[PDB]
């Protein structure tokens, strides 16, 4: 086991994010028992994970990890239960993980983080109903927006536009944001108010199309342009927690639910693959940069699963 790396990874696996080189970022929370905290882990050998001894680097966070994102190749931006957004930085030798900054700007649990297209800015979402924009270099809040009227579930930055990000809330709003507009937010949704929106993913190539999951397990593909609810499938028996696009030219879409299932869907939203591997909540997915047919899922069952997709 490495120096500064704990003996024991917390049971509840929150996030799995592959870097460009194929190294695996792991976020975990302690959600029960005496101590309610979290941990950040780096596995240069992804197949060793979750075993702590065979880890490249690991650190303990003061509190649990609600969300995570890579900041380039050595940066890790963290949504903490503490209401802090914290910046953690990889070592030159990448043998330990060090806190760059921890700012307690959110009045409640930071639920969601995304890095904007520049990599010098991020958006945070919290149960405190506020969405914040971060100057990562000066480590401050540029803007704080109370657009929503309930807890913010997801924030997802545009692939290529540093002013554009989606947000969804239990106020049943999907908001399309552009910080260039004096009124930055715009309500986007199908004709009928429907089930609460839970999960968000921009199309990687198509900068004006995204997909959202709902609390009823429906996955939906949306065109800002047509502003029509184009395609919807009942993919899950429960809440859609996460939506991740494959690195493929025509991308595959990974769907993860509290139903403890993973599904992989074509661009038409039809189902290619299904894994019942997890025996608790499925929290994240990252496709291997190296082999684009390989997909890693993590769950509260502390399982790190590696899937081969047909």
């Amino acid at each position: 086991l490495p120096p500064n790396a704990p003996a024991c990874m917390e049971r509840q696996l929150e996030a799995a994010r592959y870097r460009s080189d194929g190294a695996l970022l792991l976020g975990a929370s302690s959600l029960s028992g005496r101590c309610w905290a979290g941990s950040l882990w780096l596995f240069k050998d992804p197949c060793a994970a979750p075993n702590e001894g065979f880890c490249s680097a690991g650190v303990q966070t003061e509190a649990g990890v609600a969300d995570l994102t890579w900041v380039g190749e050595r940066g890790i931006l963290v949504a903490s239960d503490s209401g802090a957004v914290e910046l953690w930085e990889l070592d030159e030798n990448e043998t330990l993980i060090v806190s760059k900054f921890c700012k307690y700007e959110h009045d409640d649990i930071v639920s969601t983080v995304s890095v904007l297209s520049s990599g010098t800015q991020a958006v945070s979402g919290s149960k405190d109903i506020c969405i914040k924009v971060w100057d990562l270099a000066q480590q401050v809040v540029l803007s704080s927006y109370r657009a929503h009227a309930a807890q913010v579930t997801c924030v997802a930055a545009s692939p290529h536009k540093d002013s554009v990000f989606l947000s969804c809330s239990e106020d049943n709003r999907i908001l399309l944001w552009d910080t260039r507009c004096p009124k930055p937010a715009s309500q986007i949704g199908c004709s009928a108010p429907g089930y609460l929106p839970t999960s968000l993913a921009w199309h990687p190539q198509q900068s004006e199309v995204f997909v959202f999951g709902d609390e009823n397990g429906t996955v939906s593909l949306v065109d800002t342009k047509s502003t029509s609810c184009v395609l919807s499938s009942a993919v899950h028996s429960q809440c859609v927690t996460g939506l991740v696009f494959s690195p493929h030219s025509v991308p595959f879409l990974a769907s993860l639910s509290e139903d403890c299932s993973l599904a992989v869907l074509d661009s038409s939203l039809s189902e290619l693959f299904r894994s019942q591997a997890h025996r608790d909540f499925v929290r994240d997915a990252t496709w291997s940069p190296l082999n684009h047919s390989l997909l890693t899922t993590v769950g509260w069952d502390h399982q790190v699963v590696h899937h081969v997709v047909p």
Partner: protein, 625 residues
């Protein structure tokens, strides 16, 4: 000083967290009993069979700590009114679980949110927990003055905020509370955690909460301003609300992160204490009204009953009212004995209900003050008080005072009176039967005689207090009508209440009473214009009396005599609370009814809706003749 707690939704170690907040000076901690993110499945495999533990151990704190220092919180994923059926069922299961754990732990209170309009199923589940063992622990319903939807930044291009005025709409949050508490049938265990924002609403919106059971005020660190020295501070309008809330003795809860980072969270609490010690001070009367706030008392019946030594002692404890009496007699004496006749003219002065002699002593001080001559009769039917009188008269007054141990209605007096003086009035004036007593005595008053007091008037005002409605409701007794509580008046220092209208005169009596045929029965119809949305729960009663000419006594707030604030007003409940829309009139009807045996009040509301007639034929409440 101030009772205050810390609200947290992140507790890595319950040990260190609690210790930290103690060092910061917080009396208690509001925290989750399960991890707020740790969503649990009860029906679907495999997540249903998730190995435990399901939370951290009771063994981590003393029973005492759990009992005194910890307020639990419902996990925020718990959505019992969710439109999604599986979420509704898992949330029903989780809510029971978390409530059952707080009961397991012996928590003094538990926080539940009212964060939307429909909380029907959430109330149905809470009612179930309450109806599962009799326990004392409070449920604090976290409601905001201002709904989050009406607080949101106007930053949505195609969803503009409705800047139009909205009287009813601005009050939507109170309706959330009202509907919840009404579904849970006004459980005494359910109270309000009032959450305050940076932007206070209209004063009408704040007034909505006047009579409500507020146990806690939640101040986000957000709403705090910064002084030049960078200290956290509040707007004067925020500060006014704190001074209002201190009067209701709520517990203040600090929520959110430290925004005054240079300074410790002692800073926020330091501010509240600063406001507490430096608050617009009250009066001795508010010290006189010390522990009696919304304390229901049986109205004394000094005719039907013989008062105790300490009852008379408390009557005597406020000198000012007797100084007023002294002044009325003094004035009446000078109006009756010309300075030429001072030594030829000795007036017969009769104290009718002399208790332990304060009016006797006031009558004596008045005669020496006027430099005029009086013979005194001290009439008192309470033979225990006659003992006090007869020791006084033997030791001090001498033969000037003839103590009479008799009911003034039965007494055959040796001579007719120039002046009869009495203190036979209650908080509703005629509610001790001064009318009937003085009527019986007037045959022995000279044809030009004076009664002090010559006149008294009862006043009524409609009031809102869900607090006092519950207080009364809680006064059910075995072996009587289950609703008799509501059909009787209570003396009470009304405190947590709203007066919906200016007091209006109800019944008036005059002494002597010249009417050839005398009827002390009354029927009065009152109309109270109401300019707010509210719930009527009952009618506050007050009185004014003219001792003599300009010398009066009043507990009516607009005309309240000075020093007489130890003498509390009366409350006439109604059985079913009555919704009143702003601009509606409350029409109340009052009867004073009689036998040879008993006098009583009956009352009904006829508008904006009809009540039942309360206390028909004195079934629940009479006053003994």
């Amino acid at each position: 000083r101030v009772s205050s707690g810390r609200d947290l939704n992140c507790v890595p170690e319950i040990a260190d967290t609690l210790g930290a907040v103690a060092k910061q000076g917080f009396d208690f901690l509001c925290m989750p009993v399960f991890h707020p993110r740790f969503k649990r499945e009860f029906i679907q495999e495999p997540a249903k069979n998730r190995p435990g533990p399901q939370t951290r151990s009771d063994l981590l704190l003393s029973g005492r700590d759990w009992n005194t220092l910890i307020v639990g919180k419902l996990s925020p994923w718990i959505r019992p009114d969710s439109k999604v059926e599986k979420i509704r069922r898992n949330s029903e299961a989780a809510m029971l679980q978390e409530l059952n754990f707080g009961a397991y732990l012996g928590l003094p209170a538990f926080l539940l949110p009212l964060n939307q309009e429909d909380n029907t199923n959430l109330a149905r589940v809470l009612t179930n927990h309450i109806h599962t063992g009799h326990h004392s622990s409070m449920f604090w319903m976290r409601v905001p003055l201002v709904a989050p939807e009406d607080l949101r930044d106007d930053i949505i291009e195609n969803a503009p905020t409705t800047h139009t005025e909205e009287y009813s709409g601005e009050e939507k949050t109170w309706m959330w509370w009202h509907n919840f508490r009404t579904l849970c049938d006004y459980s005494k265990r359910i109270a309000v955690a009032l959450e305050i924002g940076a932007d206070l609403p209209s004063n009408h919106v704040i007034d909505r909460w006047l009579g409500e059971p507020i146990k806690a005020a939640i101040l986000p660190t957000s709403i705090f301003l910064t002084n030049k020295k960078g200290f956290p501070v509040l707007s004067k309008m925020h500060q006014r609300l704190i001074f209002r809330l201190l009067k209701l003795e709520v517990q203040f809860i600090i929520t959110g992160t430290n925004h005054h980072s240079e300074k410790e969270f002692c800073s926020y609490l330091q501010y509240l204490e600063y406001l507490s010690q430096n608050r617009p001070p009250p009066n001795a009367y508010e010290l006189f009204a010390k522990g009696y706030e919304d304390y229901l008392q049986s109205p004394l019946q000094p005719l039907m009953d013989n008062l105790e030594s300490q009852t008379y002692e408390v009557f005597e404890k406020d000198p000012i009212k007797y100084s007023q009496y002294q002044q009325a007699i003094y004035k009446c004496l000078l109006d009756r004995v010309p300075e030429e006749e001072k030594d030829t003219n000795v007036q017969v002065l009769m104290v009718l209900g002399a208790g332990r002699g304060p009016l006797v002593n006031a009558s004596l001080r008045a005669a020496k003050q006027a430099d005029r001559r009086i013979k005194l009769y001290a009439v008192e039917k309470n033979p225990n008080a006659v003992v006090t009188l007869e020791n006084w008269q033997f030791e001090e007054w001498g033969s000037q005072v003839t103590v009479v141990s008799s009911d003034m209605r039965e007494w055959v007096a040796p001579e007719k009176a120039d002046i009869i003086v009495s203190e036979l009035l209650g908080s509703f004036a005629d509610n001790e039967l001064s009318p009937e007593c003085l009527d019986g005595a007037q045959h022995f008053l000279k044809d030009d005689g004076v009664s002090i007091p010559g006149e008294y008037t009862s006043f009524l005002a409609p009031i809102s207090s869900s607090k006092l409605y519950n207080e009364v409701r809680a006064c059910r007794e075995k072996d009587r009508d289950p609703e008799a509580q509501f059909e009787m008046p209570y003396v009470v220092r009304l405190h947590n209440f709203h007066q919906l209208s200016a007091p209006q005169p109800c019944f008036t009596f005059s002494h002597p009473n010249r009417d050839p045929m005398i009827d002390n029965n009354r029927y009065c119809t009152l109309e109270f214009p109401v300019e707010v949305n509210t719930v009527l729960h009952g009618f506050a009663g007050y009185f004014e009396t003219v001792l003599y000419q300009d010398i009066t006594l009043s507990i009516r707030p607009e005309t309240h005599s000075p020093g007489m604030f130890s003498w509390f007003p009366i409350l006439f409940p109604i059985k079913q609370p009555i919704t009143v829309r702003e601009g509606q009139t409350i029409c109340v009807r009052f009867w004073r009814c009689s036998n040879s045996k008993k006098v009583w009040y009956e009352w009904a509301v006829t508008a904006p809706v009809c009540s039942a007639i309360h206390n028909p034929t004195g079934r629940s409440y009479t006053i003994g003749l």
